[PDB]
Design a protein around this ligand. Structure first.
Ligand code: CDL
Ligand code: CDL
Ligand code: CDL
Ligand code: CDL
Ligand code: PEE
Lengths: 69, 65, 119, 49, 74, 99, 61, 99, 75, 50, 185, 269, 75, 75, 75, 23
């Protein structure tokens, strides 16, 4: 048998940490919106990648497709 | 055994081939004194499980309960 | 992924494992159980799991999601659609990484090279 | 011809065949081949059926 | 038939209808063959994140207690 | 084993039909993001990829990804979190592969 | 190998009075000479296989 | 193959009794101390550990919890963030993981 | 689509077949009532009742046919 | 197996969820109707053969 | 003549496009509903507008109604409301079934007192009442099988046996037997 | 300290929604009447579960409801071959002992699972990895031997096969990478600069016309005269395209006593 | 395909033929019942019962036809 | 295929013709039973027996057609 | 080809026409027997044998029709 | 694994006749 402590403690732990990830997830999306196309494609990119701009297109920045908070 | 992944040809426990059989206990006193059927209610959880309650008594005192 | 409307039934059966499931074609008889009127083209009924999807939309348009959609003809379409895409996703992954499990694959029972025979 | 070309799955028990781990310890390192995917099974002349 | 919703979307079944003839209809199925291999590859480039984020490690010695669920036999 | 047996008994079946909004078996994420992909949008193709990755998670019923042990984003309690954070499908597929 | 050899179908006589369709049909059948082609496996009768079109009425148990 | 077939790696001795089949003994089995002896032996270890092994404990537990992480880059982050800027190799020697 | 609709209305026309048979059956029934009455007029009230009852059974088929008719025409 | 006493055919739908879409009160509505048709098949058979 | 619209073709040159129009126009089969027409079709009259399956407003409104109680809440409130329900394992959850199935017995205590004079009339009543029970019990004989009750799926199903691994494997997994027909090692 | 309620309760706002799938007047009328008195009716049963009380599932008349199992052709015969076709009937008939046994898992799906290695074997792996990142691989022989000794042999065979599978899946994902990153003849010399500023919507029905004649009102003003003229123009172009045609290839499946190739089937019989 | 559906809905109309014949057969039966009653009214109750009995047999065919009709209309 | 099936189901509809004549013959049968009973009611049971006996020979033809109908519809 | 086969099956339906007239001729036959019986019941046996005898010849033609029916359908 | 399982390398057509199974 697996510990009953783990099953119930981990169920609370996971949900309590998702609430803190939601807040961090918001600040990242906010800070990335104020970032240039050059930065969001070169930062965290592979060293061997040579950046080449793409044609500018209109793509909305919607956090939750469903009208949720 | 079927759900566990072993397909079963035939049926019963009267193994036609090279297997040991276990006939039912002969209903006579000779075998009824030497053998007795396995009571499932005697298979228990180890009482060491109850020693985990020691954590509860310690946490209660740590929190001032 | 299947890039056609038809697939050989044997190509999704196991060769070295018991066959407890098939991957059948869409059940067209369920389309005639809808009492209401609808427009359906025959060019969309053979592709996998899509007919059950369109039927679900037709039932969610005629009825809603509360106390009217809960009728046997409409719930079975929603269940078939949810189940068809789950099995097909599993068979598709098993086809991608475990092609040796299925009938018709040359790796299910590899044929030896002539140099392995000693002639 | 159909029953000549009617085989059963899984062949024979592999554990009753010579192991590769044993040949290595005996002094013969086996070579790994690939599956022959180009051959098509066919039945012989009728006289052999 | 994996990547169902992706394939159904590339074929355009969300906004239009397929041609009613097999010749052109079967060519359109084989047309997304390149794109599925691309979208499949994109999905295999995700960077990792700490597994100890929304899930406690079950191999921690803390969970060696093998504790049961206490119940009330109503 | 030989234990106490009853003459008459009832066996419950907690069926996961997926078509009943009365219980927790209703997959709200799948139906919402599926109905969302039906409408014309710029992300119409992105929502399709999210759904195909959600199906690849249900396909992995391992000890670290299952409702029985109440794992996050696999149990009935956490089905609503998918509506807010569908990006975590990759985090799971890697987690199940790590353990 | 033993299973494979066992599938090579044996020869089963056409003469059958146990199935009433053949009891009637075989009275009008013409026995024509089967000219030897040089083999030992000429299927001039039906075959002892459950899936043979002339033996499906026979119960193989 | 026989269904009741088992391969055992340690010696066992079977009883040569009528109507019964069981393992009556294990060759060269030494009886250790009794439960009451090991109990007293452990009480002495827990007592000294209770009186003399509780100072400077909060720091060692943080190091131990940091080293239970999956990747090394997270361990280093745990030590720098929770353990007040501790070194990887310097903490591994305190815990006893260094050779 | 349009063809079956044409077949629906056609069947709806066939409903007038029992209507025709009911006319003949009606004249026949009252024909016997007139004769049967001359044989034993003392009980006219009895025969008269049985006569009308039969007519009720005749129109029963009528309502049934028209009933079935409109059904297939709209169902 | 619902008509068997102490059935051991566990793989024969005994351990599965078996629902139907017929009329409920089965032994009052459906099963009697199956015997009604049975009585017709045997009465029609007697009349024809006799 | 060709009519223009918002939906455009995919050809760069105008010749390829004109070839596509002449290509499609050469396959048109006109079916008119008016007599005295060279292309007249009483039946089998083809429509000139294609139908497209789309989610209606009743479709999109009911899906948005399923999320109504969430739009008024934040993510933290959603978790604390529907996810992090304080554990309380003191309730007799199975009372729901004891009341339902126990009613057959209580109903029998009342029904066995029917003032129907004829004994064989009450035979029909109990036969009808038994038909109601056997829809759940299934097998009328004792020590033969189990009743069948479909229950709602909740997070508390098998809550007190989640720790046992063999109970999960027995309920969830139907293992596929292999040619080497043995239980997994 | 009130009992916890699930999200479904806030949708219906009641525990007693009398949901019956059987669409007969007798059943739905009784349900509507029962749905109203559920608050003061002792014969009330819940269909919405809660923390304090379980609930029943969907009702089918007096019995219970479950969807028809997904069609499965696997079956087992008893007396004679029934030739079961799950697509021939809407609802699956009950299995009779002397007729048929259906496949297992009326309501089941295909998943992938994994056996959980023993706790002591897991601890030996944690010690090796830990001693590896600290002391290096060359100083972990004793910890490696503890794995080969304590871990049962079936566990070591699983560990051996895992590495062989992920080696297989690695090559399969890299072959897909190659076919994906292959530059076709129609994209030679083209880069991101040659891409048009279009999004997914620009390829839908509103902007990109489908390949059908009645997708819009483009060909609605076409007369029969314009059609006859177009047939003459397309036939003129065929005086230049019909000049060539692929040559007939030899039949690879000519011999019926040979394993035939699974060649693409003809569009039409 | 569509043509079979058309002939089906049409055959369903054919069921109105027994509905028509049953009407005429009813008129004839009650016609004789009236004459039969006048001949011997002492047994009015006997004739009356047998009269309705025959009609019950007439509706048997009616039910047999409509039954066969809806079946062929859906099978 | 369907077209041949269309004329098969079409034939299946023709089976309702004996079902129609059987009703008229039934009405005629009970009509004679009534008048015949009035002339000699002393042998009621005798007439009654032969009445139902004839109605059986009617259905003999009826069931025969239905057999022929379903057969050719599937054979 | 397809046309002729559709006509063959069609003729096979026409064979159900005598099946209809046989029903009417049957009811009429037993209708008269009841009258003939009530007229002179002393000679019941003679009437009865002749009654069933005629019926035999009646369905004889009916069986004869089915022969021609299957003939053209297969010959 | 079903005991009456066979892998055939040439096409066969099975008759869809009641009470019988054959090629
Ligand atoms: C002439 C005809 C000859 C032909 C004969 C027929 C031959 C063909 C046979 C065909 C067989 C059919 C096969 C059926 C398949 C199913 C079999 C099965 O699964 O059984 C499993 C089941 C498993 O039990 P087990 O393996 O035997 O024992 C281990 C269990 O764990 C133990 O279970 P537990 O843990 O739950 O309980 C343990 C125990 C613990 O309790 C105790 O120990 C305390 C004991 C106190 C008992 C008091 C009882 C209550 C009384 C209250 C009144 C006040 C008492 C005051 C005194 C008390 C003082 C303290 O409690 C009891 O078990 C009580 C037992 C009651 C015994 C009373 C009768 C005494 C013997 C009667 C012999 C005569 C009848 C046999 C036929 C004779 C023919 C010549 O075995 C049973 O069969 C149970 C009995 C059911 C038998 C019926 C079987 C047929 C089914 C249909 C019959 C329906 C019954 C009504 C019929 C109409 C009657 C009028
Ligand atoms: C005891 C009593 C029991 C009751 C017994 C009940 C028995 C019931 C019998 C019912 C079964 C037989 C009926 C068959 C119907 C088939 C014909 C049909 O319906 O018209 C379709 C037919 C085709 O539609 P369309 O508008 O031409 O399509 C134009 C597209 O461009 C076309 O191009 P597309 O690209 O769209 O292709 C469409 C495709 C679609 O194909 C399909 O989906 C199904 C096609 C099946 C065709 C099978 C062909 C088999 C080859 C037969 C070869 C011989 C045929 C000629 C000889 C027939 C006599 C044996 O191909 C076709 O449409 C093929 C149709 C070709 C024409 C077939 C010849 C028409 C029948 C000739 C007689 C008509 C008048 C008779 C006078 C009646 C007066 C009482 O309509 C016509 O051609 C024009 C004439 C329409 C009929 C006249 C309307 C005026 C009013 C007449 C009053 C009577 C109405 C009926 C009730 C009768 C009760 C008295
Ligand atoms: C001052 C004089 C009086 C003036 C007032 C006059 C007005 C009187 C009526 C108003 C007051 C009623 C008081 C109770 C409130 C009930 C309100 C309500 O809405 O109930 C509707 C209630 C619920 O409707 P439902 O949702 O359809 O549930 C029934 C389903 O069958 C259920 O089927 P299922 O499958 O869904 O569920 C199975 C079910 C089990 O269901 C069954 O198995 C029963 C099935 C029926 C038999 C099967 C054959 C059915 C054939 C179909 C046709 C039946 C027609 C019956 C029509 C009866 C019309 C009332 O098990 C359960 O669900 C839970 C059962 C456990 C409940 C335990 C009992 C709690 C009740 C309170 C106990 C204290 C009351 C006093 C004790 C009794 C007197 C000694 O309908 C019924 O009551 C059904 C009849 C049951 C028999 C009750 C007879 C009691 C009469 C007592 C009269 C008062 C005492 C007389 C003293 C005389 C001296 C003065
Ligand atoms: C100041 C006053 C104060 C007091 C006021 C009190 C007011 C009381 C209000 C009560 C409110 C309603 C009560 C609701 C609770 C019902 C509880 C319950 O057990 O019902 C369950 C029962 C079963 O439904 P379920 O279990 O909930 O399942 C849902 C669907 O059924 C599932 O769909 P499915 O298709 O799967 O189900 C199949 C369907 C199958 O289809 C059927 O429904 C079968 C019915 C077909 C036959 C219909 C004809 C019946 C008429 C026969 C009598 C006619 C006489 C006159 C004819 C003249 C002709 C011109 O249903 C069944 O299986 C039914 C089986 C159970 C019934 C059969 C056994 C009945 C026993 C009869 C024994 C009678 C002996 C006398 C005893 C009387 C007292 C106990 O539900 C009902 O039947 C509701 C009954 C509604 C009453 C109808 C009125 C009947 C009128 C009787 C006329 C004779 C008496 C006249 C007296 C006049 C007095 C002035
Ligand atoms: C039935 C025995 C009655 C007499 C017995 C006398 C001996 C008494 C000895 C009792 C010793 C105490 C042992 C502990 C008892 C435990 C009871 C139990 O487990 O169930 C309690 C549990 C409490 O519910 P929860 O909120 O979920 O649990 C919270 C826990 N704090 O109670 C229940 O399950 C509810 C049902 C209780 C029994 C109901 C009685 C049924 C009879 C119904 C007829 C009554 C009239 C009805 C009229 C209806 C009018 C609308």
């Amino acid at each position: 048998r697996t510990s009953a402590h783990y099953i119930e403690i981990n169920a609370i732990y996971g949900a309590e940490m998702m609430k803190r990830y939601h807040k961090v997830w918001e600040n990242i999306i906010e800070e990335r919106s104020k970032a240039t196309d050059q930065e969001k494609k070169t930062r965290y990119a592979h060293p061997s990648y040579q950046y080449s701009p793409l044609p500018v297109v209109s793509i909305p920045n919607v956090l939750n497709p469903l009208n949720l908070q | 055994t079927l759900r566990a992944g072993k397909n079963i040809e035939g049926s019963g426990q009267v193994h036609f081939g090279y297997h040991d059989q276990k006939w039912g206990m002969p209903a006579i006193p000779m075998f009824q004194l030497m053998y007795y059927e396995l009571p499932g209610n005697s298979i228990v959880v180890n009482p060491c499980r109850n020693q985990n309650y020691r954590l509860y008594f310690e946490m209660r005192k740590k929190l001032g309960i | 992924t299947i890039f056609a409307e038809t697939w050989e039934a044997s190509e999704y059966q196991y060769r070295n494992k018991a066959n407890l499931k098939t991957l059948p074609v869409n059940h067209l008889g369920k389309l005639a159980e809808l009492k209401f009127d609808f427009v359906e083209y025959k060019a969309h009924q053979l592709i996998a799991c899509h007919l059950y999807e369109r039927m679900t939309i037709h039932c969610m348009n005629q009825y809603g999601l509360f106390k009217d959609f809960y009728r046997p003809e409409c719930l079975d379409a929603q269940y078939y659609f949810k189940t068809c895409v789950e099995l097909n996703a599993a068979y598709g992954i098993q086809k991608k990484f475990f092609p040796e499990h299925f009938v018709g694959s040359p790796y299910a029972r590899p044929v030896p090279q002539f140099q392995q025979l000693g002639l | 011809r159909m029953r000549y070309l009617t085989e059963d799955p899984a062949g024979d028990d592999p554990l009753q065949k010579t192991k590769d781990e044993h040949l290595v310890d005996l002094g013969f390192i086996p070579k790994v081949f690939g599956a022959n995917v180009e051959v098509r099974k066919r039945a012989p002349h009728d006289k052999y059926l | 038939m994996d990547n169902y919703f992706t394939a159904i979307t590339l074929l355009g079944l969300r906004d239009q209808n397929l041609p009613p003839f097999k010749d052109a209809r079967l060519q359109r199925y084989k047309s997304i063959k390149k794109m599925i291999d691309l979208i499949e590859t994109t999905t295999k480039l995700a960077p990792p994140m700490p597994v100890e984020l929304f899930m406690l490690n079950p191999t921690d010695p803390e969970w060696d207690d093998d504790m049961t669920y206490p119940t009330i036999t109503h | 084993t030989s234990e106490s047996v009853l003459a008459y008994d009832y066996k419950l079946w907690y069926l996961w039909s997926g078509v009943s909004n009365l219980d927790e078996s209703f997959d709200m994420f799948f139906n919402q993001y599926w109905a969302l992909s039906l409408s014309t949008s710029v992300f119409q193709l992105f929502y399709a990829v999210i759904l195909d990755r959600y199906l690849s998670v249900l396909f992995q019923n391992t000890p670290y990804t299952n409702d029985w042990f109440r794992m996050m984003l696999h149990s009935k309690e956490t089905a609503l979190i998918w509506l807010y954070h569908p990006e975590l499908s990759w985090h799971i597929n890697g987690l199940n592969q790590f353990f | 190998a033993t299973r494979w050899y066992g599938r090579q179908p044996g020869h089963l006589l056409r003469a059958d009075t146990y199935w009433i369709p053949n009891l009637v049909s075989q009275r009008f059948a013409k026995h024509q000479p089967a000219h030897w082609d040089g083999t030992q496996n000429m299927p001039i009768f039906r075959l002892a296989d459950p899936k043979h079109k002339d033996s499906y009425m026979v119960q193989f148990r | 193959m026989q269904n009741t077939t088992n391969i055992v790696h340690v010696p066992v001795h079977m009883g040569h009794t009528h109507y019964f089949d069981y393992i009556d003994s294990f060759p060269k089995l030494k009886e250790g101390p009794t439960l009451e002896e090991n109990h007293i032996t452990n009480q002495k270890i827990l007592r000294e550990q209770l009186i003399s092994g509780q100072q400077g404990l909060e720091q060692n537990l943080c190091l131990r919890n940091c080293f239970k992480l999956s990747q090394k880059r997270y361990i280093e982050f745990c030590l720098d963030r929770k353990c007040g800027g501790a070194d990887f190799q310097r903490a591994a020697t305190i815990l006893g993981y260094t050779k | 689509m349009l063809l079956v609709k044409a077949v629906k209305v056609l069947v709806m026309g066939g409903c007038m077949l029992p209507i025709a048979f009911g006319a003949l059956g009606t004249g026949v029934l009252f024909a016997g009532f007139n004769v049967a009455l001359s044989r034993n007029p003392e009980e006219t009230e009895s025969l008269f009742n049985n006569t009308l009852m039969g007519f009720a059974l005749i129109e029963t088929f009528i309502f049934m046919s028209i009933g079935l008719g409109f059904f297939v025409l709209f169902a | 197996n619902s008509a068997l006493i102490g059935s051991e055919n566990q793989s024969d739908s005994m351990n599965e969820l078996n629902t139907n879409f017929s009329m409920t009160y089965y032994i009052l509505t459906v099963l009697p109707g199956k015997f009604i048709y049975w009585i017709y098949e045997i009465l029609h058979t007697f009349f024809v053969v006799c | 003549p060709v009519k223009e619209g918002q939906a455009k073709l995919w050809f760069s040159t105008k010749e390829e496009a004109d070839a596509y129009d002449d290509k499609m126009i050469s396959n048109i089969e006109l079916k008119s509903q008016d007599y005295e027409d060279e292309n007249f079709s009483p039946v089998f009259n083809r429509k000139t507008q294609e139908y497209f399956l789309e989610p209606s407003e009743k479709f999109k409104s009911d899906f948005a109604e399923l999320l109504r109680p969430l739009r008024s809440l934040s993510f933290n409130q959603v978790v604390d409301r529907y996810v992090l329900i304080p554990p309380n394992h003191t309730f007799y959850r199975n009372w729901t079934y004891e009341k339902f199935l126990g009613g057959f017995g209580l109903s029998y205590l009342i029904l066995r007192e029917l003032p129907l004079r004829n004994f064989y009339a009450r035979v029909f009543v109990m036969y009808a009442f038994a038909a109601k029970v056997l829809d759940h019990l299934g097998n009328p004989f004792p020590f033969s099988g189990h009743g069948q009750i479909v229950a709602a799926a909740d997070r508390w199903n098998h809550w007190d046996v989640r720790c046992y691994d063999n109970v999960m494997k027995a309920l969830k997994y139907i293992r596929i037997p292999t040619v080497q027909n043995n239980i997994p090692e | 300290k009130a009992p916890g309620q699930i999200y479904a309760y806030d949708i219906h706002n009641t525990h007693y929604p009398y949901v019956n799938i059987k669409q007969d007047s007798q059943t739905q009328l009784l349900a509507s009447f029962r749905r109203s008195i559920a608050s003061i009716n002792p014969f009330s049963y819940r269909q919405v579960p809660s923390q304090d009380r379980a609930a029943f599932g969907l009702r089918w008349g007096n019995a219970w409801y479950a969807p028809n199992p997904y069609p499965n052709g696997i079956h087992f015969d008893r007396v004679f071959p029934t030739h079961y076709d799950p697509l021939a009937e809407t609802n699956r008939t009950k299995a009779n002992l002397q007729l048929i046994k259906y496949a297992p898992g009326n309501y089941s799906t295909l998943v992938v699972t994994s056996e959980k290695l023993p706790r002591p074997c897991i601890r030996t792996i944690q010690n090796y990895r830990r001693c590896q990142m600290v002391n290096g691989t060359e100083k972990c022989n004793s910890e490696a031997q503890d794995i080969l000794a304590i871990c049962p042999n079936w566990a070591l065979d699983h560990m051996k096969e895992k590495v062989r599978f992920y080696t297989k899946a690695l090559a399969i994902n890299n072959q897909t990478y190659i076919r994906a990153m292959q530059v076709e003849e129609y994209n030679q010399g083209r880069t991101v600069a040659d891409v048009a500023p279009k999004t997914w919507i620009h390829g839908t029905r509103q902007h990109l016309r489908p390949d059908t004649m009645w997708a819009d009102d483009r060909y609605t003003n076409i007369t029969q005269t314009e059609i006859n003229e177009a047939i003459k123009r397309v036939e003129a172009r065929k005086a230049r395209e019909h000049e060539k045609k692929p040559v007939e290839q030899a039949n690879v499946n000519a011999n019926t006593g040979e394993q035939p190739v699974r060649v693409e089937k003809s569009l039409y019989p």
